[PDB]
From a paper:
Rift Valley fever virus (RVFV; genus phlebovirus, family Phenuiviridae) is an important example of an enveloped virus that harbours a class II fusion protein. As with other phleboviruses, RVFV displays two glycoproteins on the lipid bilayer envelope of the virion, Gn and Gc, which form higher order pentameric and hexameric ring-shaped assemblies. While the Gc glycoprotein is responsible for membrane fusion, the role of the Gn remains undefined. Virus entry is completed upon Gc-mediated fusion of the viral envelope and host cell membrane, in a pH-dependent mechanism.
We solved the crystal structure of RVFV Gn to 1.6-Å resolution. Although, residues 154–560 were present in the RVFV Gn construct, electron density corresponding to only residues 154–469 was observed, indicating that the remaining 91 C-terminal residues were likely cleaved during crystallogenesis. Superposition analysis revealed a high level of structural similarity between that Gn structure and the one reported in this study (0.4 Å root-mean square deviation between 261 pairs of C-alpha atoms, respectively).
Residue numbers in the entry: 154 to 287, 290 to 379, 393 to 469
């Protein structure tokens, strides 16, 4: 029912630095065109958390909107002899890469965007851990995690993973465990906050406060086919702008509506709003929330 999933909050840039050959349809993503770093997120059921929060930012969008910092280095060369800095974090993740990707990206333990990358024209293997030779490569990067992001000033410097009975989750050793342990790949929820590391969680509990801020709207104009349109051009009631706009009841409560004189139509974005997450009993406003499938070791005997 939502026809505006490609009408992106923010700049809407779904490319990774160093892979710019599909900028025409990824920078920004919009109604028209294919984008190998974004289109996979909308395949029904593949990325269920993002699809529940699809008017929030992807990881690449959050990087280009300066909400999430890039890791140093920003891509790891999987081919390199004697290693790369991503290998430990990547190996504890169980991931499936489709064929023909040169790059795949993820939110690392420090809360920054890292990526693994193959040479030309090498593709990642199915487990995303190696490169192999391949008609032609995709021009973007495969998102390894199901997540979504938003801006936040809420300090998470005292927040840390606390998981009952867990000794290790991903690359995080949580506590001393000298007994015999059990091991499994688990799909674990996590969040990243201002000034925190990745916080893995026993349970994902989210709430959304809807509002009438700009990222709560999607605006479109007619290509002279729909085209994404920036609401910042639209005058507020009592204010000025550079364009004429119209929209739904929520839009017209705050913005001028000029009906048949409008250059664009704006409507409230389904599911948008400020997201908070419950973490060790307290609600906090995260930068990003997601799931990843990682090795987990639990106390046993």
């Amino acid at each position: 029912e939502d026809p505006h999933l490609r009408n992106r909050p923010g700049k809407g840039h779904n490319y990774i630095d160093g892979m710019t050959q599909e900028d025409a349809t990824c920078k920004p993503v919009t109604y028209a065109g294919a984008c190998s770093s974004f289109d996979v997120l909308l395949e029904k059921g593949k990325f269920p958390l993002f699809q529940s929060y699809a008017h929030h930012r992807t990881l690449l969008e959050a990087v280009h909107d300066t909400i999430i910092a890039k890791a140093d280095p920003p891509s790891c060369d999987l081919q390199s002899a004697h290693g790369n800095p991503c290998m430990k974090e990547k190996l504890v993740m169980k991931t499936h890469c489709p064929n023909d990707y040169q790059s795949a990206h993820y939110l690392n333990n420090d809360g920054k965007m890292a990526s693994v990358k193959c040479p030309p024209k090498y593709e990642l293997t199915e487990d995303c851990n190696f490169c192999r030779q391949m008609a032609s490569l995709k021009k973007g990067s495969y998102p390894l995690q199901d997540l979504f992001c938003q801006s936040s000033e809420d300090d998470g410097s005292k927040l840390k993973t606390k998981m009952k009975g867990v000794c290790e989750v991903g690359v995080q050793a949580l506590k001393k465990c000298d007994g015999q342990l059990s091991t499994a790949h688990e799909v674990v929820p996590f969040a990243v906050f201002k000034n925190s590391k990745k916080v893995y969680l026993d349970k994902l509990d989210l709430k959304t406060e809807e509002n009438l801020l700009p990222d709560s709207f999607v605006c479109f104009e007619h290509k002279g086919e729909l085209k994404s349109f920036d609401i910042s051009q639209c005058p507020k009631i009592g204010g000025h702008g550079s364009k004429k706009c119209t929209g739904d009841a929520a839009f017209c409560s705050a913005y001028e509506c000029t009906a048949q004189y409008a250059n664009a139509y704006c409507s409230h974005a389904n599911g948008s709003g400020i997201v908070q997450i419950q973490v060790s009993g307290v609600w906090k406003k995260p930068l990003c929330v997601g799931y990843e499938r990682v090795v987990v070791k639990r106390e046993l005997s």
